Every structure is written in structure tokens, then in C-alpha cells.
Design an enzyme around this catalytic site. Structure first.
Site, PDB file in Angstrom:
ATOM      1  N   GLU A 109      52.834  59.051  51.074  1.00 16.82           N
ATOM      2  CA  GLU A 109      53.981  58.218  51.452  1.00 16.82           C
ATOM      3  C   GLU A 109      54.963  58.886  52.418  1.00 16.82           C
ATOM      4  O   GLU A 109      56.154  58.960  52.125  1.00 16.82           O
ATOM      5  CB  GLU A 109      54.741  57.777  50.199  1.00 16.82           C
ATOM      6  CG  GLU A 109      53.904  57.028  49.179  1.00 16.82           C
ATOM      7  CD  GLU A 109      53.599  55.598  49.590  1.00 16.82           C
ATOM      8  OE1 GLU A 109      54.081  55.155  50.655  1.00 16.82           O
ATOM      9  OE2 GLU A 109      52.870  54.916  48.838  1.00 16.82           O
ATOM     10  N   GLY A 120      48.179  51.335  40.424  1.00 13.77           N
ATOM     11  CA  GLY A 120      47.416  51.889  39.321  1.00 13.77           C
ATOM     12  C   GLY A 120      46.179  52.606  39.819  1.00 13.77           C
ATOM     13  O   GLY A 120      45.560  53.383  39.091  1.00 13.77           O
ATOM     14  N   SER A 121      45.834  52.339  41.076  1.00 17.86           N
ATOM     15  CA  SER A 121      44.623  52.857  41.705  1.00 17.86           C
ATOM     16  C   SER A 121      44.457  54.369  41.562  1.00 17.86           C
ATOM     17  O   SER A 121      43.355  54.857  41.314  1.00 17.86           O
ATOM     18  CB  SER A 121      44.617  52.479  43.183  1.00 17.86           C
ATOM     19  OG  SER A 121      45.818  52.895  43.805  1.00 17.86           O
ATOM     20  N   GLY A 122      45.554  55.101  41.727  1.00 21.51           N
ATOM     21  CA  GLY A 122      45.546  56.540  41.535  1.00 21.51           C
ATOM     22  C   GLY A 122      45.221  57.331  42.787  1.00 21.51           C
ATOM     23  O   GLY A 122      44.416  58.265  42.745  1.00 21.51           O
ATOM     24  N   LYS A 123      45.848  56.972  43.904  1.00 21.97           N
ATOM     25  CA  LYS A 123      45.564  57.656  45.156  1.00 21.97           C
ATOM     26  C   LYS A 123      46.278  59.003  45.227  1.00 21.97           C
ATOM     27  O   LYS A 123      45.756  59.957  45.813  1.00 21.97           O
ATOM     28  CB  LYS A 123      45.931  56.774  46.355  1.00 21.97           C
ATOM     29  CG  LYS A 123      47.119  55.858  46.178  1.00 21.97           C
ATOM     30  CD  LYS A 123      47.032  54.658  47.108  1.00 21.97           C
ATOM     31  CE  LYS A 123      48.184  53.693  46.868  1.00 21.97           C
ATOM     32  NZ  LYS A 123      48.289  53.268  45.444  1.00 21.97           N
ATOM     33  N   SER A 124      47.460  59.089  44.620  1.00 25.77           N
ATOM     34  CA  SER A 124      48.202  60.349  44.586  1.00 25.77           C
ATOM     35  C   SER A 124      47.460  61.404  43.775  1.00 25.77           C
ATOM     36  O   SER A 124      47.410  62.572  44.159  1.00 25.77           O
ATOM     37  CB  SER A 124      49.603  60.148  44.009  1.00 25.77           C
ATOM     38  OG  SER A 124      50.406  59.374  44.877  1.00 25.77           O
ATOM     39  N   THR A 125      46.892  60.983  42.648  1.00 24.73           N
ATOM     40  CA  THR A 125      46.040  61.848  41.841  1.00 24.73           C
ATOM     41  C   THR A 125      44.917  62.438  42.690  1.00 24.73           C
ATOM     42  O   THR A 125      44.700  63.659  42.712  1.00 24.73           O
ATOM     43  CB  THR A 125      45.427  61.078  40.659  1.00 24.73           C
ATOM     44  OG1 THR A 125      46.470  60.471  39.886  1.00 24.73           O
ATOM     45  CG2 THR A 125      44.616  62.013  39.781  1.00 24.73           C
TER      46      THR A 125
HETATM   47  N1  LIG Z   1      50.303  63.567  34.843  1.00 24.41           N
HETATM   48  C1  LIG Z   1      49.894  62.377  34.398  1.00 24.41           C
HETATM   49  N2  LIG Z   1      49.709  62.214  33.069  1.00 24.41           N
HETATM   50  C2  LIG Z   1      49.298  61.022  32.616  1.00 24.41           C
HETATM   51  N3  LIG Z   1      49.028  59.912  33.308  1.00 24.41           N
HETATM   52  C3  LIG Z   1      49.220  60.107  34.625  1.00 24.41           C
HETATM   53  C4  LIG Z   1      49.638  61.271  35.228  1.00 24.41           C
HETATM   54  N4  LIG Z   1      49.724  61.100  36.608  1.00 24.41           N
HETATM   55  C5  LIG Z   1      49.360  59.856  36.786  1.00 24.41           C
HETATM   56  N5  LIG Z   1      49.039  59.188  35.630  1.00 24.41           N
HETATM   57  C6  LIG Z   1      48.606  57.804  35.520  1.00 24.41           C
HETATM   58  O1  LIG Z   1      47.489  57.630  36.369  1.00 24.41           O
HETATM   59  C7  LIG Z   1      47.588  56.395  37.105  1.00 24.41           C
HETATM   60  C8  LIG Z   1      47.515  56.683  38.583  1.00 24.41           C
HETATM   61  O2  LIG Z   1      48.647  57.492  38.959  1.00 24.41           O
HETATM   62  P1  LIG Z   1      48.948  57.788  40.484  1.00 24.41           P
HETATM   63  O3  LIG Z   1      47.900  58.718  40.965  1.00 24.41           O
HETATM   64  O4  LIG Z   1      50.378  58.303  40.677  1.00 24.41           O
HETATM   65  O5  LIG Z   1      48.808  56.349  41.161  1.00 24.41           O
HETATM   66  P2  LIG Z   1      49.314  55.984  42.596  1.00 24.41           P
HETATM   67  O6  LIG Z   1      48.133  55.635  43.433  1.00 24.41           O
HETATM   68  O7  LIG Z   1      50.066  57.182  43.248  1.00 24.41           O
HETATM   69  N6  LIG Z   1      50.309  54.630  42.465  1.00 24.41           N
HETATM   70  P3  LIG Z   1      51.636  54.595  43.522  1.00 24.41           P
HETATM   71  O8  LIG Z   1      51.751  55.947  44.330  1.00 24.41           O
HETATM   72  O9  LIG Z   1      52.956  54.395  42.680  1.00 24.41           O
HETATM   73  O10 LIG Z   1      51.506  53.446  44.473  1.00 24.41           O
HETATM   74  C9  LIG Z   1      48.857  55.688  36.635  1.00 24.41           C
HETATM   75  O11 LIG Z   1      48.557  54.614  35.752  1.00 24.41           O
HETATM   76  C10 LIG Z   1      49.672  56.802  35.963  1.00 24.41           C
HETATM   77  O12 LIG Z   1      50.363  56.298  34.825  1.00 24.41           O
HETATM   78 MG   LIG Z   2      51.032  57.546  45.110  1.00 28.62          MG
END
Ligand SMILES: Nc1ncnc2c1ncn2[C@@H]1O[C@H](COP(=O)(O)OP(=O)(O)NP(=O)(O)O)[C@@H](O)[C@H]1O
Ligand SMILES: [Mg+2]
Ligand SMILES: Nc1ncnc2c1ncn2[C@@H]1O[C@H](COP(=O)(O)OP(=O)(O)NP(=O)(O)O)[C@@H](O)[C@H]1O
Ligand SMILES: [Cl-]
Ligand SMILES: [Cl-]
Ligand SMILES: [Cl-]
Ligand SMILES: [Mg+2]
EC number: 7.-.-.-
Lengths: 247, 263
Positions: free
Chosen positions: B162, B43-48
Site C-alpha cells: 500500500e 481477507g485474501s492475505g496479500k500482506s502475509t
Molecule cells: N499475525 C497474525 N495472526 C493471526 N491472524 C493473522 C495475522 N496476520 C494476519 N492474520 C489474518 O490473516 C488474514 C489475512 O491477513 P492479511 O495478510 O493482513 O490480509 P490483507 O491482504 O493484507 N488484507 P488488507 O491489507 O487489509 O486489504 C486476515 O483474516 C487476518 O485476520
Molecule cells: Mg495488506
């Protein structure tokens, strides 16, 4: 219960065989881990098991022959990329999807698989906007909802952190105890608690198939040996885990 | 080369009943020649974050300053690899897929040599993969194609989401070789990887996210020695015992670690 039986099974995509005369039996109640380098044939084998690919040779589901359409009917499959089995404006529609073929029940078999994979409370969200790990969780859920005798998973937790990987595998293990066949393709093996068999695939054939001990012994180079086990055979029980909490 | 993110936060769809606080006031400095591991739960959002840093999205409340700035041909030196490779494909042939960056930022030069060396340093034989369809490859082969396509034009910033996922042992040592051979060039690398245990020999600084918040921004050496070890792998706990008493476990083969633990 049941038992899939691959006899003299080989497969071509278009060119040369990616599977060359495979023989195996996958029986309910035990768990099978499938390993081998990139381009060895793990996914192809698994898709042939779940009736997603028609292969050359004979495949029996419980003594009788089985076409793909019968195999699908009894093996749930989970893709390496979860996105290719995600469909529906929301998550419950997604899980519901292969409850296609009632509305009463078809709603907490749902949130049961959702609480199982750890996805409770997001059932009203666009699947498309889940995180990567959560999309994988989703795929696991939708396959579990099917309630198949066999679970064919193609690197299902390859993007969950090791705690999450460990917990998901414990879910699978539970389902092994309830009399579900489990065939698991993975590259980690790190989070694996226990297993009945390890199959190794070299270039279309099953090279090895036995206990874990036999595996660490034969010495394969394409597969990473878990640091945990290396640390088990030497040092022995050092009770390392205390460091996680240290009183 | 000197990516600095200042009080960034991002809100997905600001207006509608969902918003979602993907990021929560993130600020960190990542110098040149430095390899940074972005870690955290799902949930951290590192990809974002890495999407923002790569200039793929615009923060709803922040700036990422490269040396000021924005977007120009700075594109040239950004190469991000998606955690799902298919999310990145667009081409019908592997060659075109890899050759993109070169054909785009360098429209004058013949791409065939560059994409050739790119492909072979991820282990993909050129006369064997160049005319195949990317979507009709194995998972590992897809990962390799992605990696290749983002290292083909040698960017200053190499953002990998990843990158280990789906690769065999050979594939992973190829990837880590890439990371090294971009630290040697004094280039910047940014990593997302739930598998800290492998990446950490080759990482200089860790950052950890938490519901958008940054709850850690120490060094590699200071992460195994100052972070909640409840969920460390055995190898990590071992390296931890080795850092706590004084030594440097980041230079011991998988066996040397063991010897220095029980013997
Ligand atoms: N385009 C989007 N629209 C709405 N919510 C989003 C979107 N992208 C990500 N989220 C939400 O933002 C949060 C973080 O997303 P994300 O950046 O993919 O986390 P993450 O670090 O990549 N987790 P993970 O890669 O699965 O280990 C999550 O709760 C998603 O549901
Ligand atoms: Mg990610
Ligand atoms: N959809 C496809 N169409 C054509 N060829 C394919 C397809 N999927 C895989 N192949 C090829 O078939 C061979 C074996 O593929 P596959 O069964 O996916 O191996 P694998 O064990 O899954 N490798 P990996 O998933 O990366 O660990 C490879 O040489 C691939 O290039
Ligand atoms: Cl068997
Ligand atoms: Cl090893
Ligand atoms: Cl092809
Ligand atoms: Mg595969």
C-alpha cells in the site's frame, strides 16, 4: 443538533504555524470533505475540531465557548492510523472501551457498529491480528459507538478497496441523514457519492469552500480529479456501468 | 532477482484454537525487471504473502526460492515497505530511520549522501526532515520516510505494501517514478494496492488472492480482459473497452482515454 464554530484559529506544533487564522462553521446534517497536499494542515484542523489539540483562537460549540475536553465530549475522531485508537484483548473490548464512562446495552450498540462497518463475527478476535482494512473498519466502529453529534474522520477508508470504500461512505451518508455532522479528510474523493461542501487547505488557511462544481472549476493541482467525473462532463451518460454485469 | 514461491501456505499459531489459514497453497513466478501487482479483498492475505516473499516470516508449509535457498546477505537486495509506516519505524530521527539499510548492510560507507538522494526522491527536503521525529510527521510524510528507507540502498527486490496510501498527487507521481526507475534498472517490484486504477499503467503482471487461494495469475493485459469486471472503476471499464476491441490503453493520457471512448 449543533454547530462548531472556529473563529481566528491558528496552531503551532513547535516552530512555525501549521494553521494560520482559520475561520469556519461546521453544522449538523451536512457533510464536509477536506482536501489539500501533504503538510497542509488537514489532520491538525480535524484534531482541533475533536478537542484532541488545543489551538489559539476561539472555538464555539453551540454559541458557548468550548475547551478541548468539551469538544471531545461531542466529536468522535478517527485516526489516519487506526492502531493509535485500538486497545483491548478482543474486538468487543475495543469497541466497549470508550463506553468507559449499562453492560446490558453496551453489547449490541457494539455489535450494531460492528455489523455496520462489516465486522460481525470477529468480535472475539485479538484486534492486533486483524488485516489492515479490518483494523480501519474497527476504528470506524469504535468511533461510531460513541454516538457523537459530529464524526471527524481522518482518511477512514484509505485502505479498503473501492467497493468497500463506497459502502462505508454510504453508511456515513445515512448517518448524515440522521442529523450527524460529518467532516471527512480524504485523498481519493473517488468513492464519494455526494457532499455538501469541499474545503481546500493550502498552507494553514482554507483556500476554497463551495460546491463540487466550483472545485473542479478553480483547478487545484494538489488534488486528483476523479476519472468518473471527467468522464461525466464529456461523453455524458454513456451508461458505462452495464459493462459490470452485461446481462 | 528471480523469486519463485512453491506450494506455500502459512498457518498463524499452529497448535492453538485459531490456526487461521492466511495463505492456501500459493505458487507463482516473478521474473527480473517485472512489476507484479498483488490484489484481492481484505481477507485474501496479500500482506502475509509479501511478508513471506520478503523473508520476514517462515512459511509453515512452503519455500520461496530466490535461486535455490533461505537467508544470507541476500537481505541486501530486499526492501519491503509496510502498509502502516509506523509499524516499521524504530528510530527517533528521520535520518537514522532512512540510513538503517546502508548502515546495516554497508557498515563501511558514509550514508549521508545515499540517504540524501533517497529522501529527495520521495520529496523530503534533507535540511528540513533529517532531524525530525518520524512519529511526529504527517501521514504522507510518514509514507515518504518509509519508501525512502526501503529504496535508499537500491535493493533488487522492492516490495511495496500500500505505498500510495496517504500521498498527495506529487507524492504518488514520485512513487511511480521510483517504480519506473527500478524497472529501467531491470529490478523487481511487488505491489499491494486496492487502487488498481493508478498502478496498472506501471504493472506488468497481476496476481489475485482469495482466502489464501490464488484465483488469478494472468498478465496486466489479460486481467482487464479476462477477470470479473463487476467491481472495476470507470477508468478500468474504459481501458477494458479499449483492450477488447484491440487497442492498448496503457499508453493514453487521462484525456486520450476519453477521446477514444466518445468521439
Ligand atoms: N499475525 C497474525 N495472526 C493471526 N491472524 C493473522 C495475522 N496476520 C494476519 N492474520 C489474518 O490473516 C488474514 C489475512 O491477513 P492479511 O495478510 O493482513 O490480509 P490483507 O491482504 O493484507 N488484507 P488488507 O491489507 O487489509 O486489504 C486476515 O483474516 C487476518 O485476520
Ligand atoms: Mg495488506
Ligand atoms: N504530531 C506532530 N508533531 C509535530 N509536527 C507535526 C505533527 N503532525 C504533523 N506535524 C507537522 O505539521 C504539518 C501539517 O501536518 P498535518 O496537519 O498532518 O498535515 P496533513 O494535511 O494531515 N498532511 P497529510 O496527512 O500527509 O495529508 C506538517 O509539516 C507536519 O510535519
Ligand atoms: Cl465553513
Ligand atoms: Cl487530475
Ligand atoms: Cl519533529
Ligand atoms: Mg493528515
Amino acid at each position: 443538533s449543533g454547530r462548531i464554530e472556529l473563529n481566528s484559529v491558528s496552531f503551532r506544533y513547535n516552530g512555525d504555524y501549521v494553521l494560520k487564522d482559520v475561520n469556519a462553521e461546521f453544522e449538523t446534517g451536512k457533510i464536509y470533505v477536506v482536501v489539500g497536499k501533504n503538510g497542509s494542515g488537514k489532520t491538525t484542523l480535524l484534531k482541533i475540531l475533536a478537542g484532541l489539540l488545543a489551538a489559539a483562537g476561539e472555538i464555539f460549540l453551540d454559541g458557548s465557548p468550548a475547551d478541548p475536553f468539551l469538544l471531545r465530549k461531542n466529536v468522535g475522531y478517527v485516526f489516519q492510523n487506526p492502531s493509535s485508537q485500538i486497545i483491548g484483548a478482543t474486538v468487543e473490548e475495543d469497541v466497549a472501551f470508550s463506553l468507559e464512562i449499562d453492560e446490558s446495552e453496551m453489547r449490541k450498540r457494539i455489535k450494531k457498529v460492528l455489523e455496520l462497518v462489516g465486522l460481525s463475527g470477529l468480535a472475539a478476535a485479538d484486534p492486533l491480528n486483524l488485516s489492515g482494512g479490518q483494523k480501519q473498519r474497527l476504528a470506524i466502529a469504535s468511533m461510531l459507538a460513541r454516538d457523537t453529534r459530529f464524526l471527524a474522520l481522518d482518511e477512514p477508508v484509505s485502505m479498503l478497496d473501492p467497493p468497500s470504500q463506497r459502502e462505508i461512505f454510504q453508511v456515513l451518508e445515512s448517518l448524515k441523514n440522521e442529523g450527524k455532522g460529518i467532516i471527512l479528510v480524504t485523498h481519493e474523493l473517488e468513492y464519494l457519492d455526494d457532499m455538501d461542501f469541499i474545503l481546500h487547505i493550502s498552507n494553514g488557511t482554507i483556500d476554497f469552500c463551495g460546491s463540487w462544481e466550483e472545485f473542479v472549476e478553480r483547478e487545484f493541482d494538489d488534488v486528483e480529479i476523479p476519472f468518473k467525473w471527467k468522464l461525466w462532463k464529456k461523453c455524458g451518460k454513456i451508461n458505462l456501468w452495464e459493462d459490470r454485469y452485461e446481462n | 532477482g528471480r523469486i519463485e514461491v512453491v506450494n506455500v501456505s502459512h498457518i498463524f499459531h499452529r497448535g492453538t484454537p485459531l490456526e487461521k489459514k492466511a495463505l492456501e497453497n500459493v505458487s507463482l513466478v516473478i521474473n527480473e525487471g517485472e512489476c507484479l501487482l498483488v490484489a484481492g479483498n481484505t481477507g485474501s492475505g496479500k500482506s502475509t504473502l509479501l511478508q513471506i516473499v520478503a523473508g520476514l516470516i517462515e512459511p509453515t508449509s512452503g519455500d520461496v526460492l530466490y535461486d535455490g535457498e533461505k537467508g544470507y546477505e541476500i537481505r541486501r537486495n530486499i526492501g519491503i515497505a509496510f502498509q502502516y509506516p509506523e509499524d516499521q519505524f524504530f528510530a527517533e530521527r528521520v535520518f537514522d530511520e532512512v540510513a538503517f539499510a546502508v548502515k546495516n548492510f554497508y557498515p563501511d560507507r558514509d550514508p549521508v549522501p545515499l540517504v540524501k538522494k533517497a529522501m529527495e526522491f520521495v520529496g523530503l527536503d534533507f535540511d528540513s526532515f533529517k532531524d525530525r521525529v518520524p512519529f511526529f510527521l504527517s501521514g504522507g510524510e510518514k509514507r515518504r520516510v518509509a519508501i525512502a528507507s526501503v529504496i535508499v540502498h537500491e535493493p533488487d527486490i522492492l516490495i511495496l505494501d500500500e505505498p500510495l496510501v496517504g500521498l498527495d498527487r506529487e507524492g504518488k507521481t514520485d512513487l511511480l517514478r521510483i517504480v519506473e526507475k527500478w524497472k529501467t534498472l531491470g529490478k523487481t517490484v511487488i505491489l499491494i494496492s486496492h487502487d488498481i486504477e493508478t498502478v496498472i499503467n506501471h504493472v506488468d503482471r497481476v496476481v489475485v488472492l482469495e482466502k489464501g487461494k490464488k484465483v488469478f495469475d494472468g498478465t496486466r493485459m489479460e486481467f482487464l480482459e479476462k477477470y470479473d469486471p463487476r467491481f472495476f472503476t470507470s477508468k478500468m471499464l474504459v481501458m477494458r473497452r479499449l483492450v477488447l476491441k484491440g487497442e492498448d490503453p496503457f499508453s493514453m493520457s487521462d484525456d486520450e482515454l476519453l477521446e477514444r471512448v466518445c468521439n
